[PDB]
Paper text:
Following its synthesis and transport from the inner membrane, LPS is inserted into the OM by LptDE, an OM protein complex essential for most Gram-negative bacteria. Once they arrive at the LptDE complex, the LPS molecules are inserted into the outer leaflet of the OM via a process for which the details are not clear, but which must involve a separation of the first (S1) and last (S26) β-strands of the LptD barrel at the front of the complex to allow the translocating LPS molecule to move laterally into the OM from the lumen of the LptDE complex.
Besides the main particle class for the LptDE–RBPOeko complex, dataset 1 contains a smaller class of LptDE dimers for which we could generate maps to ~3.4 Å. Interestingly, only one of the LptDE complexes has bound RBPOeko and represents the open state, whereas the other lacks the RBP and is closed. No particle classes were observed for dimeric open or closed complexes.
Author numbering:
A (entry chain D): 225 to 784
B (entry chain C): 22 to 115, 139 to 208, 232 to 321
C (entry chain E), E (entry chain B): 19 to 168
D (entry chain A): 197 to 208, 225 to 784
The structure:
């Protein structure tokens, strides 16, 4: 029924005093509302939050209209601004209708790019660069489905305002099989790339990807010969400003027609492990591939929605290197890989290892041949991969991954994680995240690999641990190092005392906030909290351990 | 510009309730000029088991018909009674003539006794200090400070002292107030210009006042600390008395 | 070292006929499990069949959660890591009910100045995490049958 | 004007305790984390780290509550190693360490002897002003060190005790201690048809300053009574002997700046005589109410003390006692054996109490006056008045207490005077209190400008903040709304200035596990000293109380009604 | 109108001999109560010496409480108001125990004085209030007689 909820007040180092009085409106039993006044001392006025969950034929969703009419601190930073109103929106409709029709929404807007950096929400964080405002709709059945999308973005940084967006994104995806021994499928696209500026290109694209997939089956083997085509029309316009600057000028209508061949294949072996540990089996799955794409000169098409993809063990056998229909690369390679499980008596997979290499024949060219590798290579066993996942017990886990490389003779990426979890309130975790600096230049744009911030790659060594002392306290820790610069990146530490009537919680964080241009050294952000939660009649309490872990900039994620 | 000679150097206490009756032979139409060097004395008056500080400044100077002068006082709160100890020098414009018996630039580091005895005229340039001359020493204190401590200070001043070697010649007399009164290239006198009682630090903080010459204009500013009578015992209304007695000014010739 | 070729398949001989139960049989997840099943020679039957001895899968709920996993020295995130959880309950007639689960971990680099090209990639990471999760489900079927026998 | 807010939340076995935080506009965020440390059945300390953000360091408030063989006890060693504000407000003291010590030992022995200690040494003169210390006694701004011994039986007494001051060099206040002070009392009755008692006191006053006089006083008060009780009336006449011997030293400074010329040895011997009477009547009051009773009760008294000149005895301890209705039938004018006045007077009075059926009193009015045959002279009479009349019916009084019902009430009190020809006081009230929560009250307080001039120090009569007297009117109300909400209020409004004096509002939601409270108050907080008009301070408070699971219940009223500068009192 | 003096409306004939048992029998209150009682004929039987059948005044706890009541124009306390509640209970031998009370009101200006001289004033004021509250306890004695007779 329409009635208020349990208040909550906290002393922070950023707003001094804050108080929440969450009301709970009510209407017919599909909708509701949780209008929540929220007073902030340093800010001045009281923030208004207007969450509105609902449910209908289409599906469930929620809204949020956080609104602070006047902010004192923001006025201090920017006294030239006429007003200092702050607001946030978040619409997240998503649901299927009539078992065929489908809708999707994901919207978020802010008053100024510096919203999430000084406020705290569940819908974004300071470690953000853009807020995604996309709408979607479409109806899907077993064979045919169409969808109309309107992706846009709200990039925060003002040093480069140019952002792209897709007005209509129509995409038909027919499906039909059992045509002789083959299978068929059709794709399609139709876009209109708008830009938030005035002196940037626009476009109009149409695509007609068919397929002729031919499947083969065996007791152990699976050879899959495939062949698809590709067409891409264009109507590029508004190139007047860009023609002067770049050497290779953009042009009008462009057709891009190219086929593609692919061959897959694998087999499954078996071997009883009773020689060392009786009762276990073990398989072995070698897998080979060959790819071939003709070369088309694509230096006269602006890169709207293409980006170079990562390379994990399963990423070796992927079709394209650029996710998106703008810079389909051209290559002819092989790809090899063997996987080795060791099941147990109950046929439960308890360990597996893998490796794979993508030896090329000629080269990887797109017609945009200007990217500078650390040391350019033509062909050979350029890139190797690898992964292994060992389930030590029910309460332990180990997971790895590595992408070795002979082109630059440096490991491009690697990541590991080992975790001991007993219950939801007692865990310990390690994790590693590496990305060699040569990879940063070869992937991210030029500006990154010339500023000091985005230059040395990433070398993280984190640690998480929690422990329920006695049965009322829930101490939680976290500390993420950066061994490249030998300076910490994040360090969180909280303690919560949970009784049957209230719950008091402390906090401490040292996230990285920004980069000081003058001294060219990192700027940290120390924050302290002291939260009082008044619960009382609530029967369920919870230690809150799972909530404190997911509060810093690098939130916890269970690796098992 | 006149050169009154001398008559007296009284340093006594009031004979009656706030009345001083220094007597000296006078000439008809002498236009008596009296320069006061102790306008105000803080007197502790008793009130039914209570020791209360109380400034006793001077208000009016009246000639006693060719036989001397009289000084009428008035305390701060206008309620209690006492006999202060004002002190000054009496002159007639119309028999020794005062002379410039000391004139050097010195730096006072908080308190400096007078090298020779006389009526001292000085001139400095600093904004965070104030200068007052009680009766035997030039007292300099930090004036921008607000707390109850007796913070000292150092100022560099041009000191001139007259007594019984250019002769003593005076000029316009300035009534020191709470506003900037420009004097130009001239030397102000040196004396206390009142008293001040303020609720501060939990005490009935009592200070004396003094000249604050910045640029070339003078203004009353706070000075040495007299005492802190606790506010747990009694609580007093604030006062910022500035004496009405004028200070002599002389041109920069000495 | 004696390794033969694995004769026993990955879909237990009991479950060569399956009934696919799901709230949304048209969405992305169903389309994956249909194709994985046909790859193993499994004849999938709908709910209107008269056979009540055919085991039936039940695709539960999915959950896509992406969080940052490595921060640049300027403060903005560098490397994301997305997870995905899908539950499923297999109902074999004549015995009890058995649950299965699948988690997929995948990553990619953030690039704030290529937002639209960093969302046509996040639609590819997911549409490839809908096909390794499926494989996980259709690889515990042996477990279910084996443990069910006892 | 000045707005300022306050946001607090905290509570009302060798482990910790619930911590209380606090945030205020001045002296910002402040956080206590106490810790109990029971270590023995008779020892238990309490170490309490205390963080003050404004001074930027942590103080350590400790305790040592002990109950060893001696007796009760307490300790306290608050210690702040470094102070940030202090180094800015006192740039003369090098170190900025702030500390306080306390000790409150006691303990009986054979249920006759006794002991007491009250050590309170502190660090710097401006300690008590800066911190709101929990334990510690300050007298005139100084910190005392009172010791004491004792002895007591059904009649005899003895209380030899000392008291010192921790006076610094920055303080100029004048205060008198008593080092030591032996006090003997003897109470023996039924000496024939009489009763007897003896008082004694050997004292030694020493001033904190080094220029005020000292002394040495011996006093004796042998008395003989003579009660005579009838059934309808009463009488009681007594005579007393007063002896006092002084020894005054360090008179150099006082004598030079004055003409009274304090003597060096003074003996004062004054015999006292007093006769008291009462008479009680009665009448059935069946004409108005069934079976009630009225009682008219006159009372008279005659007092006589000779006049001895006391200009040569310094006033070590003597206030000037004020008046009420029952103050008419008194013995001394000045409180203390230092300025014993002289009187030759007769006092008269009338009451009238109305009883109901259960013999429960309901009403009582009173009237009284003092007739001075000879003007009361003490030798140092310097009191300002508004009339030259000195002998006769100078002062009148009054009283009333009507109890309308069990939940109503009324009160009075007037002090008419003829040395100024107008009312001097008119304290009054009327209240309706149902239970702890629902209550309504009205007030009134008057004090004529001539009264302020005739009693308070002489700088009250020449200050605009004091010289106008008092004429304020008040009102206090409270009423719960639901079973968990309470509302209070107050509004005191001057009528000589048509400007309010205090105005408070409070709302409390109280449950079994927590309770939140807000507040508002618009008080008077000093004079301007520049434009001659009062200055108001507006404060808004917000408090959260962590009520643990127990029987500590209360809607919050009677605790927020005592928060403004004019607290609430039952007056019923 | 006739006024027939009084009819022994003093301490009831029953309570003409009692025992003044008190927590602290040597304090100021106990001696104050004793005085009024002796002046009212009552002889105080030595503390619990007779066997029984005599009432007892069991003096309780006192509570002095000084509060502000008016302020000058600069927000400075002008008048205080002391209030002193004093409890008591009369034991009637066998019958029952009946409660009594007292509540004395005193107001005065806050005169700024010394500390040795302000203590002597606040001691005389308290001692006076003890006499007036002890008096009120020797009334309400005709009351318990009327409440015990019914």
């Amino acid at each position: 029924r329409s009635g208020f909820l349990i208040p909550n007040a906290k002393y922070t180092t950023t707003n001094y005093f804050e108080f929440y009085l969450p009301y709970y409106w009510n209407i017919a039993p599909n909708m509701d509302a949780t209008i929540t006044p929220h007073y902030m001392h340093r800010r001045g006025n009281i923030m208004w939050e207007n969450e509105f969950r609902y449910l209908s034929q289409a599906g469930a969703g929620l809204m949020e209209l956080d609104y602070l009419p006047s902010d004192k601190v923001y006025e201090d930073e920017h006294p030239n601004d006429d007003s200092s109103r702050r607001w946030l929106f978040y619409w997240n409709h998503s649901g299927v209708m009539d078992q065929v029709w489908r809708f999707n929404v994901d919207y978020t807007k802010v008053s100024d790019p510096s919203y999430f950096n000084d406020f705290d929400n569940k819908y974004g964080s300071s470690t953000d660069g853009y807020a995604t405002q996309k709408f979607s709709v479409g109806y899907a059945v077993q064979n045919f489905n169409a969808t109309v999308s309107t992706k846009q973005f709200q990039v925060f940084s003002e040093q480069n305002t140019s952002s792209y967006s897709a007005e209509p994104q129509l995409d038909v995806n027919y499906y039909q099989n059992d045509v002789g021994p083959f299978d068929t499928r059709i794709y399609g696209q139709a876009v209109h790339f708008v830009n938030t500026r005035d002196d940037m290109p626009e476009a109009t694209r149409v695509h007609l990807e068919p397929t002729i997939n031919l499947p083969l089956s065996n007791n152990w083997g699976s050879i899959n010969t495939e062949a698809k085509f590709l067409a891409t029309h264009y109507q590029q316009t508004n190139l007047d400003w860009y023609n002067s600057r770049n050497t290779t000028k953009l042009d009008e209508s462009v057709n891009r027609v190219m086929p593609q061949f692919k061959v897959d294949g694998k087999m499954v072996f078996e071997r009883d492990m009773e020689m060392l540990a009786p009762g276990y089996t073990q398989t072995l799955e070698p897998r080979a591939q060959y790819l071939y794409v003709p070369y088309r000169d694509q230096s006269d098409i602006y890169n709207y929605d293409s980006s170079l993809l990562q390379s994990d063990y399963s990423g070796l056998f992927r079709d394209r290197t650029y996710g998106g229909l703008d810079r389909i690369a051209s290559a002819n390679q092989v790809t090899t890989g063997v996987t080795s499980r060791i099941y147990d008596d109950a046929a439960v997979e308890r360990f597996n290892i893998s490796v794979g290499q993508i030896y090329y024949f000629t080269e990887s060219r797109t017609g945009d041949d200007n990217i500078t590798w650390e040391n350019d290579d033509k062909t050979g066993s350029l890139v190797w991969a690898g992964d292994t996942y060992w389930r030590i017990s029910e309460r332990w886990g180990l997971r790895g991954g590595i992408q070795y490389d002979t082109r630059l003779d440096n490991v491009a990426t690697s990541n590991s994680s080992i975790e001991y979890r007993r219950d939801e309130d007692r865990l310990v975790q390690l994790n590693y995240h590496y990305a060699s600096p040569e990879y940063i230049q070869a992937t991210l744009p030029k500006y990154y690999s010339t500023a000091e911030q985005y230059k040395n790659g990433i070398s993280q060594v984190g640690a998480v641990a929690s422990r329920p002392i006695a049965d009322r306290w829930s101490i939680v820790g976290a500390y993420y190092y950066d061994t490249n610069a030998n300076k910490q990146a994040d360090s969180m530490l909280g303690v919560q005392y949970s009784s049957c009537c209230y719950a008091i919680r402390v906090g401490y964080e040292r996230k990285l906030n920004g980069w000081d241009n003058d001294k060219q050294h990192a700027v940290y952000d120390n924050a302290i909290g002291f939260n009082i939660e008044l619960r009382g009649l609530s029967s369920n309490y919870g230690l809150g351990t799972q909530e404190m872990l997911r509060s810093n900039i690098l939130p916890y994620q269970n690796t098992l | 510009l006149r050169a009154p000679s001398y008559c007296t150097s009284f340093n006594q206490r009031a004979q009656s309730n706030k009345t001083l009756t220094i007597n000296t032979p006078l000439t008809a139409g002498s236009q008596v000029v009296v320069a006061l060097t102790r306008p105000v004395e803080v007197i502790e008056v008793f009130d039914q088991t209570l020791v209360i500080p109380d400034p006793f400044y001077v208000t009016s100077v009246t000639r006693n018909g060719n036989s001397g002068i009289t000084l009428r006082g008035d305390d701060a709160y206008g309620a209690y009674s006492g006999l202060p100890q004002w002190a000054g020098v009496i002159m007639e414009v119309l028999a020794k003539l005062m002379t410039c018996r000391y004139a050097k630039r010195v730096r006072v580091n908080g308190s400096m006794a007078l090298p020779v005895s006389g009526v001292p005229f000085a001139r400095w340039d600093d904004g965070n200090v104030s200068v007052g001359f009680d009766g035997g020493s030039i007292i300099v204190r930090n004036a921008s400070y607000g707390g109850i401590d007796d913070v000292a200070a150092s100022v560099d001043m041009d000191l001139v002292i007259f007594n019984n070697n250019k002769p003593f010649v005076y000029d316009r007399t300035i009534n020191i107030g709470t506003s900037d009164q420009n004097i130009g290239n001239s030397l102000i006198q040196l004396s206390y210009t009142g008293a001040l009682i303020q609720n501060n630090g939990g005490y009935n903080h009592v200070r004396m006042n003094g000249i604050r010459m910045a640029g070339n204009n003078v203004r009353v500013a706070k000075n040495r600390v007299i005492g802190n009578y606790s506010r747990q015992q009694f609580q007093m209304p604030g006062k910022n008395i500035a004496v009405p007695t004028p200070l002599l000014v002389i041109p920069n010739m000495y | 070292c004696g390794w033969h070729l694995r004769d026993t398949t990955q879909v237990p001989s009991t479950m060569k006929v399956m009934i696919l139960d799901s709230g949304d049989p048209n969405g992305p997840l169903s389309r994956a499990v249909r194709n994985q099943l046909r790859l193993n020679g499994v004849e999938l039957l709908d709910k209107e069949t008269t056979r009540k001895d055919v085991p039936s899968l039940r695709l539960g709920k999915v959950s896509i959660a992406k969080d940052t996993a490595s921060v640049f020295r300027n403060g903005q995130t560098a490397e994301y890591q997305m997870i995905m959880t899908v539950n499923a309950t297999v109902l074999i007639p004549g015995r009890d009910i058995y649950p299965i689960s699948a988690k997929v971990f995948r990553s990619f680099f953030d690039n704030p100045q290529m937002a639209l090209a960093k969302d046509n990639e996040q639609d590819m990471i997911v549409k490839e995490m809908y096909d390794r999760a499926a494989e996980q489900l259709i690889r515990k079927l042996p477990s279910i049958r084996a443990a069910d026998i006892r």
